[model samples]
Target chain A: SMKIDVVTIFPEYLQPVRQSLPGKAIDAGLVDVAVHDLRRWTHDVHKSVDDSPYGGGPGMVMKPTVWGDALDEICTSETLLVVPTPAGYPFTQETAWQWSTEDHLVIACGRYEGIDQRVADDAATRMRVREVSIGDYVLNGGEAAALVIIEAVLRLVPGVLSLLEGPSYTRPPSWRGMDVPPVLLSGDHAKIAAWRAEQSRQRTIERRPDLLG
Target chain B: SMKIDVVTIFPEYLQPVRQSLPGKAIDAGLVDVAVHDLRRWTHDVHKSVDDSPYGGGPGMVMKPTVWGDALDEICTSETLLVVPTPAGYPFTQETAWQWSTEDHLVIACGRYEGIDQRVADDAATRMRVREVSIGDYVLNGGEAAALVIIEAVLRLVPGVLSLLEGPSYTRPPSWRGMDVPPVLLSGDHAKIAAWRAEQSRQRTIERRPDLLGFDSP
Candidate 1:
């Protein structure tokens, strides 16, 4: 079973957990997921989870202690650590494909100035840790990036999306003067299948040429 | 005022619109956002918004007619169209800053193989439309990417997050044998300001050197 967990200050941020594919996968028992609150690991009454940077900086840095304790409490030997940061490796389909095979996934949401660098390094001491980024841009926090990863990675897991991304049409073949390509309507399975292969390639080339590469 | 709209087949995909910063922004009336179901604009009884690709394809393509009609009915001048696609330009902080100033923003949540390319081409004729990708990877659809964008953009709108993500701290600075740098606690005004600037640069350098050119040690 594919096990997933996200450690975030904003547990509500993962509310998408109850929304779509991620929700369906959990209900169907295809994946086991947990959303953790970072503040829970803080010792103070105020529940402080951030501190100033080691060097003087305008933004506060996420303290290492909270994250350190949190990871130690939850991470196991088999967990694969995915930390989303603009500073990390580019997140791509190939990366998702590679990650879908893991027995467990633990995503640490980097907030404030980001998790203390040591937190990631120490996690590496106990598990396979990789810092990954969703895009070139930045978000207010990592929770959104975690949502993207959850959707992207889970869809690729073997049994979750057996019928995904396949096109279908019903009713009148033509709508508003636009016609479904004639070949799809033909009963010849071999020719229809061949034509679909070409279209998927053609569309990818026109829209997402990077996938072709 | 900043206005935002997201059109998607799975309106449920936009549930996150009500959660965090974007929700706060809408509640405060700082930004106006509308998440419209694509089926709402479709004329058919079944209320479907996708069609077979003009060429045979494994995944369906969002129909152009539904999109064209939707844009015609809702979009106007001064609107910036944001379509999330793996094929689009790399979205960055610079792009978010640019979009923060727009009067109206329309985000089309693309599904299937993709939106009929013509919907984009046609939208460009009437307004400024940008195809933006959240990252290098793909999602089941663009709704998650759209949620990613709503948070990314709304958080940067002027006063809302002026101090967010830059640097911050609370009480009890000492913990786990770590101390806040001495310079920050020092009373010197000018030195502290300059030091903070350099620290920001150094942190970015240490983490994302791609933002800065690598140098010989």
Candidate 2:
């Protein structure tokens, strides 16, 4: 079973994963997950986690000391640190597939501007650190991105985008005015498979020609 | 203020958005969001929401009628439907920017396999519909993707990938064995700005040279 530990200021934001498909996996004893509050490590009355960036900037940078303390407690020799950032390497199906095989993952979810650079730089000395972006868009924080990343990694599969599935129909067969294709109703397995193959191919060509390459 | 409606089987999965930055925007009257359970439209004994996909390979498909009833009640002539699917066009900063300006959005989240394709095609007759994917990866359901999509659109900012920010440091000024760069403390805004510009450029070159385009020197 793989293990994942998520550290964030808003630990409650990760509650969805616990009640989702990933939660079922956890209940089934297929994966182990733990959510930790980043504020737990701070001793100050404010329980602050961020401060001004060294170089002038628009947003606060996650303080190194707070993150350093958190990581020191969570990271082990075999842990792979996954930090979500807009500037990091693009996270794809391939990245998810590769990470699913790892024994342990420590995801540090940053809020505000970002985690101090030293967190990743120093952690690289004892463990593998990867900075990943869900896409080209920037979100308010890493919690949402972490949810997206964790779900993708947990449900590892080949890229589904490259395959365009043809239209699908269901019960009632006939709706207000539409009906299921006749071929799908035919019981001949060979005929159904062939028709589906052609339909799938044509859809891929018409909508996502780039995938054909 | 913009408005958004999300329909899903697991409405609780979207609870995070109500407790996150997007939630604050809603509280501040910057946006309006409503989460409706898809099961609300189903009247079956079990309140079923899915069935075998007609041209099947794997997983169940969301019943079109359930979606139709939900959309009919929620969608207006001005609503823009956003469907999250790996097979759809990639969702990028550009897409987020464009959508942020829209007056209304109805996000229908699908589980099992996906919503019947007709939902989008039929809805297109009266309102705009867009099928979008957050990235190349697949998830167990669209609730997580919808959260990611909503957060991006709500935070609308320029494409930050084209620029790499220089390293950031904070209070204590010195940690373990490290110290903030001297120039940052010199108070010479001109020199500080120049150093940051060079640092940003060099990092973009070293880590993501592909973003520099064909004019790279």
Candidate 3:
């Protein structure tokens, strides 16, 4: 079972984690999940975890000291530290597949404007520090984005989801009015896989071509 | 104060709404935020809100009945109903400002694969139904995207924030580092206003020029 530890200021938000699909995975012993409150590591009486950006900005940046202690307690060489930020690499299905292979995963959800750059930099040396962006927009914090990654990746892990008759793992073309490419439903496994690859290429090209390199 | 209600399968996920800057807004009664579980409105033994798509597909689509009833209880002629989906119109600061002016807002956060098309269509006729995208990406559900919009729009309401200067309601170019172009910081109100207009134009052009029209020039 893969283990994931989430570090966030508002740990109560993680209650959904225990009640959703991830909870099922944990119950089945396919994954282990825990939410850690960053405030516990705060050095001050107010449990302050943010300070004005060093360069000066409207929003505050999360302090590095709090992050340092949290990482020390949660990480190991096997852990993959994922940081969700608007400035990071765009998340994709392929990235989710990569994470499912890891035995341990850690996510730091930054609030305020951003996190101390040093926390991100320090986490980089020991493990894979992925800066994943859900889209080209900004969020109040990275917690929601982290949940998106966790749900996607956790589902990819073996035994986490029941594989129904026929290859149930194939990606659907579209959900609701969202259109999935015509090639996905073609019924030929090889061709369908190729079509999906091409679709991902085209979709990303039409939308976020910056990921093409 | 605008009244906003959210219908979602995981109502607990909305807990953050009670903690952050928006929490303060809710407390001040600037916004009445309520989250209702769609399952509570379902009559089936399983309390299912989703089923396999009509044309045959991989993921399940949310049932229209559950969504229809939940929306009926909350929606009004004045309420602006928003659905967060990848296929929706891109969300923007302008959209948030528009919502801030509204008297009521309601959001449907779909889980599983997507909501039944009838639900989307029904909500459209009774109210201003807008499909909004936070970015050019995908999420497992619309709940997160709805949260993003809530945080963005609530902050724009009059007293949602506590500023020493009493809510310096400046336009986009109000802050630096993503620096507010020099003209805005020039300290001349008229020049600043003109600079803001041009800045909005230039900023939109550089970042999201798709929002501009031929008549704009």
Candidate 4:
């Protein structure tokens, strides 16, 4: 139901994450994954893709030319162009669910020191552009953040994990002196479902209390 | 300056992360990255590493034995054992900078639905074991999250980006009709530093308002 493509200067960075679930989904045709090198759009010999910030900053902002050229080729009126930056909205499970419904997702992995602000402003005219953050932390580039995002979004793709027992379990419920509480072993499906719901709530509170906000 | 090893059931999942900056760092000897198949420590004929939760759940939890064994083989008394989980503490750039100073970082990629809770407890006995969350959302496993953490951390290793221009930039500053603020090209050091500082603050405020606490920046 979704088409995801990653545009990164570090195209090779998409290699490993494309192996497991995301890879499986791609191989099965459950989802399509493509990697585009931003430099290809550059006509110059250096294939330069970045430049200094307009106002002067620590890192170079991605040059608008290559980004614009690349978008012209891959971007669609319906595409949701994602820009992963520390400046964007915090990404959540809900965002993953929301993105899974898109027809085309062109993820722009910027090396966050800067991105020509105009690129984002201009892209708004042709496609839906969103600046999203994976967390409070800063990653070296968007490729790493995209790995987290695409993996999560791919999980929602149909048939990708259907045959896999729906987040199933394993045997030997007890190991290393840790016991699989008897409630799980008990054949009470209703009780087990209720228990899991309770666990998620309790787990969230016990683990990520800040999420309550 | 850092040796990072990842423990995961899906060892191949680490290939892509090892390609770019991460791969370069490893190649440059700025850091050592080794991916270990967690099943290597499984003594069972099936080589199984995960089991159903103790209290009835849809997802599986990893066992403690293999993890205990693996850490025994890979971890040192001084190593920092990092477990990436949505349930763990939040990860931040500050944390990344701090971890860059560590001699060894053993990342446990928990594809194995939640890991046996005891694995962390056991690891903390001898070494520093901390559970961290890269973000609020959950991935099928921790491998990708670990990749994010490691990349951010390696950026701080002294010489990793030394050849690069300290985040500097270049030319044609007026392309696309967007002006490269005149103050930058003015060659005024004081003005440039202050402009960058102000830009950083504004960027942070506009991009991550929560960082400023209660907005109004």
lDDT of 2 by residue, A1-213 (tens): 778899998888998686554445656667777899999988699999888876576789888888999999999999999998877777888889899888899999997378888788889989999987788677878899888887888776232115776767777687666677878777887888889788878877865776777
- Local accuracy of candidate 4 as per-residue lDDT tens digits, A1-213: 567889998888886655444455566666777898888899789888886664354567777778888988999888999988766777888899998888899999988675676678779977798888887766678888888888888777676530011122334555456555566678888887776667666666665666565
Assess the local accuracy of residue A176 in candidate 1 as a C-alpha lDDT between 0 and 100. 53
Give the root-mean-square deviation of each candidate in angstroms.
5.5, 3.8, 9.7, 4.9
Higher-TM-score candidate among 3 and 4?
4
Candidate 4, pairs of clashing residues: A16-B16, A58-B167, A87-B207, A180-B54, A181-B54, B60-B113
Q: Model 3 segments beyond 4 Å from truth? A: A21-24, A55-57, A158-213, B43-48, B92-94, B135-140, B161-217
Leading candidate by DockQ:
2
| TM-score of predicted structure 1, chain A | 0.79
- In candidate 1, position B92 carries an lDDT of 76
Error of 1 at A130 (Å): 1.6
TM-score of model 4 (CA atoms): 0.84
Q: For all candidates, state DockQ relative to the true structure.
A: 0.29, 0.59, 0.11, 0.39
Q: How should the candidates be ordered by DockQ, best one leading?
A: 2, 4, 1, 3
Give the TM-scores of the predictions, in the order they appear: 0.79, 0.90, 0.70, 0.84
Label model 3 with its docking quality class. Answer: incorrect
Q: Write the per-residue lDDT of candidate 1 for residues A1-213, one digit (tens) a residue.
A: 788889988787775554454456667777887889989999889998886654454567787778888988888999998988765666888889999888899999976267766677667777999887787677767888898998888888866640112234433455455555677677777888777677656656555564545
TM-score order of candidates, top first = 2, 4, 1, 3
